[PDB]
Amino acid sequence: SMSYTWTGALITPCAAEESKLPINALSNSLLRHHNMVYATTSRSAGLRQKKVTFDRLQVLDDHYRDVLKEMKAKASTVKAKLLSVEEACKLTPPHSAKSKFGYGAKDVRNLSSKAVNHIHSVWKDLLEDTVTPIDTTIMAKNEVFCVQRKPARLIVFPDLGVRVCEKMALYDVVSTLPQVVMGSSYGFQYSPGQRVEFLVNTWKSKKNPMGFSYDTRCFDSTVTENDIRVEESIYQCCDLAPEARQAIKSLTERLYIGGPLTNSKGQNCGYRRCRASGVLTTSCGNTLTCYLKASAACRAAKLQDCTMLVNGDDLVVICESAGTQEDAASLRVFTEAMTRYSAPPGDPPQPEYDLELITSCSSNVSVAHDASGKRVYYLTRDPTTPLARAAWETARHTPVNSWLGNIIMYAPTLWARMILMTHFFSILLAQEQLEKALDCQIYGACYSIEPLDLPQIIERLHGLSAFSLHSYSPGEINRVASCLRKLGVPPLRVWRHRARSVRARLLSQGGRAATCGKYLFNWAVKTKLKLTPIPAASQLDLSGWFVAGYSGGDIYH
């Protein structure tokens, strides 16, 4: 069926939207090529609508069915609990879109009974009605990029009351099921370093490794009613409370499978018959579905000694090469199978034979050296989008601080250390806002993070090694340098200079700020300090960080 049917009503903004990089007094110290940076707005949503609107046909064979049977067997071993209203409420982000029923995320979080009452009525409705399509709002995402212009992505989501209901019914399922079903293939269980460890060991476990990433064209849109019912049947394999089963059946029939689309002005924009990107099960359903299709496609393609790594629609496969010609033919067959399953490629997959050249989750493994001179593998990515976004965040307060996420997730990298840490620590110093906790996202989930904890956070996620990496790869350095020329970011030598200042300014504050100065900026100075373990690092609640992915899932930790 058509992934979408549109009425003609526009996708409308709430607030007026800025597409142009806001410039303040700090902007130029990060970036000079301001016109390279933009934010998507609803005003390009029509282009997106066109892209995402197509017919899906699906042809399911025995490999598909075998894998599903296997997945269901693993899923039958999971037991999940219903969350209480209160618990579901506490997982709601403070910025989460307000209900149309006259209450907002903050009413939910501090548990006003106006919200709780409504949520209870939503839940009772979900139990009583398993057929009535649930209304959804379609919005254009405002996200920041560097010009290559992408149209806005679309966010489709049910009312706040329904979302708390999704959490009650499904939060535990989407938190536990994926790792049980997909085992080590489930990408969201990995910190970046564990992700590197997995990729590195898997690569090394092959006599002749070949790897490829598979780009599905608009994954959400290729997701069919059948896919969404299949994933429900996987959920229902779990040991669930009877109300959980009912709510899941009902959210599936009424929401997940499809539904009417309403813009922010209240007009009907049409109808959706594919994955909604603003629901709890977006990440988990995509992951399962991507895994299901891809594992079946690996069998179709007779890929040998095949290891998958899946995060939502992001798939990377490492397997035994059969030589470039056979590999290419394998990927064609893999692609035809995926296509038959309604997951056709954007860019057709290409075999790669160097781990460091495989991009997956927009990242690649790279190598630098620790203090010992010993080679170390770590995760990096092209810094262009991070820096674009840092530039936006340099002038604008934003609900999510990508800079802070990037420093955390990419702490060991050259660009996060020399540029992100230097710039933003500089800004925090100047505003004496070092102590203020900032919201950032990790695997789609919102965390409140205190910048002063970065050293302990990075020691925990990455090891002290991340504060000592040097002698980065030529291809990594060239990518960064090239990125800096594109965006007009000052060279790494300026950043080193600045960092020496930022470091001393931090050391002078003493305490946590001084620890930030000490660890975060040890690289900056000729004559270095001894980076020993940080006692407080071992006191950090890093439980929940890399358990599952929660994008579009309206999740706050």
Ligand X SMILES: CC(C)CCn1nc(-c2cccs2)c(O)c(C2=Nc3ccc(O[C@H](C)C(N)=O)cc3S(=O)(=O)N2)c1=O
Nearer to ligand X, 49 or 189 (CB): 189
Nearer to ligand X, 44 or 385 (CB): 385
Site mask, ligand X, residues 156-195, x = CB under 6 A?
A: ------------------------------------x--x
Nearer to ligand X, 153 or 512 (CB): 153
- In the bound state, the residue with its beta carbon closest to ligand X is 312
Instruction: Name the minimum Å distance from CB 528 to ligand X.
Output: 26
User: Does residue 522 touch ligand X according to CB under 6 A?
Assistant: no
In this chain, which of 412, 444, 455, 517 binds ligand X, going by CB under 6 A? 444
Q: Does the annotation list 215 as a binding residue?
A: yes
Interstrand relation of 445-449 and 438-442 (parallel, antiparallel or unpaired): antiparallel
Q: Rounded to whole angstroms, how far apart are CA atoms 436 and 242? A: 43
Exposed / middle / buried, residue 25 (Cβ in 10 Å: 0-12, 13-18, 19+): exposed
DSSP characters for 132-168? SPPPEEEEE---EEE---PPPPEEEE--HHHHHHHHH
User: Does residue 442 touch ligand X according to CB under 6 A?
Assistant: yes
User: Does residue 556 touch ligand X according to CB under 6 A?
Assistant: no
Residues, the chain, total? 557
Nearer to ligand X, 85 or 140 (CB): 140
Q: Are the C-beta atoms of residues 154 and 49 closer than 8 Å to each other?
A: yes
Instruction: Name the minimum Å distance from CB 492 to ligand X.
Output: 21
In this chain, which of 185, 189, 222, 282 binds ligand X, going by CB under 6 A? 282
Instruction: Name the minimum Å distance from CB 505 to ligand X.
Output: 26
Binding segment toward ligand X, per CB under 6 A, in 26-34, 50-58, 138-146, 309-317: 309-317
How many residues lie near ligand X (CB under 6 A)?
Answer: 24
User: Does residue 36 touch ligand X according to CB under 6 A?
Assistant: no
- Side-chain-facing half-sphere of 507: CA atoms under 13 Å: 13
Dig out the tokens for 312 from the structure. 């939502």
Torsion over CA of 455, 457, 461 and 466, rounded to 10 degrees? -10
Q: What is the 3-state secondary structure (H, E, C) of 207-248?
A: CCEEEEEEEECCHHHHCCHHHHHHHHHHHCCCECCHHHHHHH
Q: Are the C-beta atoms of residues 307 and 323 closer than 8 Å to each other?
A: no
What value, to the nearest 5°, has the Cα angle with vertex 76 and ends 72 and 77?
130
User: Does residue 441 touch ligand X according to CB under 6 A?
Assistant: yes
Q: Does the annotation list 347 as a binding residue?
A: no
Binding segment toward ligand X, per CB under 6 A, in 336-344, 437-445, 449-457, 524-532: 437-445
Phi and psi (nearest 5°) for 380? -135, 180
Phi and psi (nearest 5°) for 240? -130, 155
In this chain, which of 137, 286, 335, 401 binds ligand X, going by CB under 6 A? 286
Of 281, 274, 261, residue with least CA distance to 223: 274
Instruction: Name the minimum Å distance from CB 410 to ligand X.
Output: 6
Q: Are the C-beta atoms of residues 547 and 85 closer than 8 Å to each other?
A: no
Nearer to ligand X, 111 or 437 (CB): 437
In this chain, which of 42, 99, 281, 363 binds ligand X, going by CB under 6 A? 363
Q: Rounded to whole angstroms, how far apart are CA atoms 280 and 93? A: 13
Instruction: Name the minimum Å distance from CB 43 to ligand X.
Output: 23
Which residues are CB-neighbours of 498 under 8 A, at least 6 positions away?
A: 422, 423, 426
In this chain, which of 178, 209, 270, 312 binds ligand X, going by CB under 6 A? 312
User: Does residue 406 touch ligand X according to CB under 6 A?
Assistant: yes
User: Does residue 443 touch ligand X according to CB under 6 A?
Assistant: yes
Dig out the tokens for 504 from the structure. 């001393």
User: Does residue 263 touch ligand X according to CB under 6 A?
Assistant: no
Residues 199-228 that bind ligand X (CB under 6 A): 219
Exposed / middle / buried, residue 532 (Cβ in 10 Å: 0-12, 13-18, 19+): exposed
In this chain, which of 119, 297, 306, 361 binds ligand X, going by CB under 6 A? 361
In this chain, which of 379, 429, 449, 489 binds ligand X, going by CB under 6 A? 379
- Side-chain-facing half-sphere of 68: CA atoms under 13 Å: 19
User: Does residue 313 touch ligand X according to CB under 6 A?
Assistant: yes
Nearer to ligand X, 195 or 503 (CB): 195
Q: Rounded to whole angstroms, how far apart are CA atoms 426 and 503? A: 9
Q: Are the C-beta atoms of residues 126 and 247 closer than 8 Å to each other?
A: yes
Q: Does the annotation list 370 as a binding residue?
A: no
Instruction: Name the minimum Å distance from CB 196 to ligand X.
Output: 8
Binding segment toward ligand X, per CB under 6 A, in 61-69, 278-286, 369-377, 478-486: 278-286
In this chain, which of 176, 252, 283, 522 binds ligand X, going by CB under 6 A? 283
Nearer to ligand X, 119 or 276 (CB): 276
- Side-chain-facing half-sphere of 321: CA atoms under 13 Å: 16
SS3 content of the chain, % helix, strand, coil (to 5): 50, 15, 35
In this chain, which of 409, 452, 457, 480 binds ligand X, going by CB under 6 A? 409
User: Does residue 311 touch ligand X according to CB under 6 A?
Assistant: yes
Nearer to ligand X, 195 or 299 (CB): 195
In the chain, residues preceding a discontinuity (C to N beyond 2.5 A) are 148
In this chain, which of 549, 554, 555, 556 binds ligand X, going by CB under 6 A? 549
Helix residue ranges per DSSP H, 268-323: 281-300
Q: Which residues are annotated as a binding site for Mg(2+)?
A: 215, 313-314
For the annotated binding site, the residues are: 215, 313-314
Residues that bind ligand X (CB under 6 A): 192, 195, 219, 277, 282-283, 286, 311-314, 361-363, 379, 405-406, 409, 441-444, 549, 551
